[PDB]
């Protein structure tokens, strides 16, 4: 019904839009927060099915960014996770566990089992999440499975690697977005769901994550509707 | 500002361009070879040091039509390249290509597989999802033959599987994905490859596709620092 299942988003632009206010990076972070609840909310309601979510900048001093990207979740949870509850909103992650801190990894497990139930749109949160990982960690899986007699060499195919991927958890006709979307005037995707993604329509903006809301959103959706036109 | 070394192009909309000069399909596909030598020159005399080309239900007489191409290419085409130094090299699945356009493929490559310039890279019965399950396919099957270890599969190990492992080591990525004829999307054309690839997006059709596009795609590649 003129809306793509499955949306993938690249948040970037958090800092600039934070340096713009005469304001600290952490300041702009915390609205990106809110402008991911603004964009989950919205799109819940449109009928978007999936969003994967990618928390990405290159506006680096990569400990500090690799320091309140991790720092997300715990936040997250505490401020933002019960109206996202509220709303029917299911939340999983996708990314690599073993590098985690326990507080982080203490609210995404909380911020999953509190919405394993939930019917509407799945937020999917890319953190600690790189494409060309995904693949190789997959690649260790199917390997092992392959000296176990699991499966022949032959067996190997496209079909199955999409099972063996982070997105395996979620079902099989939304595993791949429709649209991903970018934001900060980038024009790349910065390992972001290169199997997945291999087939999807782009949309790049000049807006800053921060600015991005349901208006901005619906922007997208409609170069989305366009682009089946051409 | 300088030349990114490793250019991907996606060639699209020889239909188009034909269409709106009101003549067959198999014209447009011809003018777009001439776009490609044009640019595959171009490039060459810039300094860029590999450029991945992909082509990509049509009429039952027009896929006789670019059948016939390949071998035009050779013939017309092949030899000016040659002459400028340019190594043609394939990517993709060329087991499944017909003998009469295989067998120009390869005297491509045969002519010029000693050749220092530019390497111009077709990419041919390709598809990126298929590229890595055709490497982890190569690799499981090393594995299971004691070749390979489970804890050697790296990133690394992947790259020197895929279909672009015959080009230089520091050259197996494109520093630029260019694509044509005004479509925002890429299309299974190296996903892996291309994960951090700056992306440049031109609503100029391929035929139109000159040295004046490239560098203002090498130009537009530079601004992004
Ligand atoms: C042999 C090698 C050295 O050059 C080759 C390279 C690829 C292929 C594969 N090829 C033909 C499909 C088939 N019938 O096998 C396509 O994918 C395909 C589909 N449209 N166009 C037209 C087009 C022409 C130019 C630009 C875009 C599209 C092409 C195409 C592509 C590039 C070139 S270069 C000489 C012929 C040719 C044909 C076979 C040979």
């Known amino acids: 019904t003129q809306v793509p299942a499955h949306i993938g988003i690249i948040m970037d632009g958090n800092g600039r839009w934070a340096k713009?206010?005469?304001?600290?990076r952490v300041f702009g972070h915390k609205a990106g927060m809110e402008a991911?609840?603004?964009?989950?909310?919205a799109?819940?309601?449109?009928?978007?099915?999936?969003?994967?979510?990618?928390?990405?900048?290159t506006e680096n001093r990569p400990d500090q960014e690799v320091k309140f990207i991790?720092?997300?979740?715990?936040?997250?949870?505490?401020?933002?996770?019960?109206?996202?509850?509220?709303?029917?909103?299911?939340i999983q992650m996708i990314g690599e566990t073993d590098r985690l801190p326990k507080q982080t990894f203490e609210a995404l497990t909380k911020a999953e089992e509190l919405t394993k139930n939930n019917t509407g749109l799945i937020l999917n949160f890319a953190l600690n999440?790189?494409?060309?990982?995904?693949?190789?960690?997959?690649?260790?899986?199917?390997?092992?499975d392959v000296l176990d007699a699991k499966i022949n060499p032959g067996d190997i195919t496209?079909?199955?690697?999409?099972?063996?991927?982070?997105?395996?958890?979620?079902?099989?006709?939304?595993?791949?977005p429709d649209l991903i979307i970018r934001t900060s005037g980038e024009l790349r995707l910065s390992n972001?769901?290169?199997?997945?993604?291999?087939?999807?329509?782009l949309?790049?903006?000049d807006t800053l994550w921060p600015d991005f809301d349901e208006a901005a959103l619906q922007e997208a959706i409609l170069a989305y509707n366009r682009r089946h036109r051409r």
């Open 192 to 201: 972001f769901l290169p199997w997945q993604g291999a087939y999807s329509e």
């Open 70 to 90: 991790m720092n997300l979740p715990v936040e997250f949870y505490d401020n933002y996770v019960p109206e996202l509850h509220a709303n029917n909103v299911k």
């Open 203 to 205: 949309y790049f903006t």
């Open 20 to 24: 713009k206010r005469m304001q600290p």
């Open 158 to 176: 496209e079909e199955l690697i999409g099972n063996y991927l982070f997105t395996q958890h979620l079902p099989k006709d939304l595993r791949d």
């Open 129 to 144: 999440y790189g494409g060309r990982a995904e693949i190789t960690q997959a690649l260790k899986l199917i390997s092992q």
């Open 43 to 57: 799109a819940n309601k449109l009928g978007v099915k999936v969003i994967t979510v990618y928390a990405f900048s």
């Open 36 to 41: 991911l609840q603004t964009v989950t909310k």
